[PDB]
Amino acid sequence: LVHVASVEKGRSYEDFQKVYNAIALKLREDDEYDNYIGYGPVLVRLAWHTSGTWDKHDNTGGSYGGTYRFKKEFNDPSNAGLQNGFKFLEPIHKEFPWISSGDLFSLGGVTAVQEMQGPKIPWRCGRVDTPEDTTPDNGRLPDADKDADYVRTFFQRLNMNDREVVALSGAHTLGKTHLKNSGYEGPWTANNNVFDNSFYLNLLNEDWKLEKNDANNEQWDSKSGYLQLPTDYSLIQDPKYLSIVKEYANDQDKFFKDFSKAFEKLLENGITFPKDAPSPFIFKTLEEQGL
Ligand code: HEM
Numbered sequence: 312l313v314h315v316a317s318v319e320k321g322r323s324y325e326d327f328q329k330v331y332n333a334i335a336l337k338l339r340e341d342d343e344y345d346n347y348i349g350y351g352p353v354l355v356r357l358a359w360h361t362s363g364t365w366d367k368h369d370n371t372g373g374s375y376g377g378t379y380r381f382k383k384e385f386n387d388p389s390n391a392g393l394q395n396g397f398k399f400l401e402p403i404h405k406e407f408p409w410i411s412s413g414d415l416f417s418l419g420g421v422t423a424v425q426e427m428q429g430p431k432i433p434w435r436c437g438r439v440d441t442p443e444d445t446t447p448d449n450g451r452l453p454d455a456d457k458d459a460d461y462v463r464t465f466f467q468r469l470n471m472n473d474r475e476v477v478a479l480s481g482a483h484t485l486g487k488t489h490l491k492n493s494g495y496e497g498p499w500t501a502n503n504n505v506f507d508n509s510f511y512l513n514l515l516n517e518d519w520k521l522e523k524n525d526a527n528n529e530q531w532d533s534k535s536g537y538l539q540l541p542t543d544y545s546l547i548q549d550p551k552y553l554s555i556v557k558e559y560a561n562d563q564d565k566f567f568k569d570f571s572k573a574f575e576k577l578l579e580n581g582i583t584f585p586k587d588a589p590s591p592f593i594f595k596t597l598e599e600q601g602l
């Protein structure tokens with residue numbers, strides 16, 4: 312199918328900045344969540360998992376339909392823990408009922424990245440809710456117990472190349488793994504609610520040991536109290552990925568620019584934007600607005 316972006320009736324930049332602001336203000340207010348990490352990271356993961364179901368071969372899945380609101384996707388084992396992000400957005404959707412679910416899920420990720428001092432991420436509106444029968448089956452999101460070849464092949468389905476894969480993986484700069492959700496435990500960085508290139512710095516500079524966690528799964532651990540999933544660690548095991556990891560670890564600006572492009576692309580895969588559609592929006596942070 313073809314999914315044409317359709318702007319919420321009569322809405323413009325100012326309307327979406329208000330939604331952005333409400334999300335940002337709630338992010339600031341509910342600071343206790345997850346031992347004070349805040350909802351920033353889970354909102355980014357929600358935006359990615361709701362977009363990552365896309366299949367370039369038949370345009371199924373994707374962020375367009377906002378299908379995560381349906382139980383089949385909502386209960387995907389791969390999405391364990393995202394219910395926290397969805398619950399956070401519920402009051403936002405109630406105040407702005409006119410925004411589509413897909414626009415809200417994706418905007419939530421953009422808002423979180425920017426408020427956490429990450430790069431600006433241009434965002435376009437127009438996603439339209441689709442029926443429950445359009446919900447993609449579980450199993451389209453990646454496994455974490457795999458190697459570089461699996462990662463490379465997996466992301467080709469989302470039309471992402473090596474650079475895009477390494478940049479997107481850098482989102483692990485945020486949050487942590489929760490044993491009860493995924494069978495992995497531990498954070499990737501110390502400042503896990505501040506978006507930066509520390510994921511790459513830690514991967515390259517920490518001393519890693521392949522250990523088994525309490526769920527009997529292998530994960531790389533550092534004495535500093537950080538982890539790297541087998542799929543994260545594969546980024547330094549593969550020579551092509553390694554060069555890019557080193558590049559981002561040594562150029563914060565380059566990582567920001569590349570992540571921004573890759574993240575917008577991820578959130579827009581499968582969507583056809585009319586030639587007369589509005590230009591992408593670049594929202595101001597609460598800080599830039601003095602709010
Ligand atoms: C090979 C691909 C990837 C794998 C296997 C993977 C796996 C995981 C796992 C196992 C968790 C822990 C979930 C939990 O226990 O709560 C996680 C968390 C997270 N992932 Fe990834 N991920 C991948 C790619 C990405 C990408 C592309 C992004 C976004 C650009 C991303 C963003 C996040 C974020 C922000 C968290 C933290 C969530 C929180 O703290 O609540 N991941 N991922």
Ligand SMILES: [K+]
Binds near residue numbers: 501502510
């Ligand atoms: K960080």
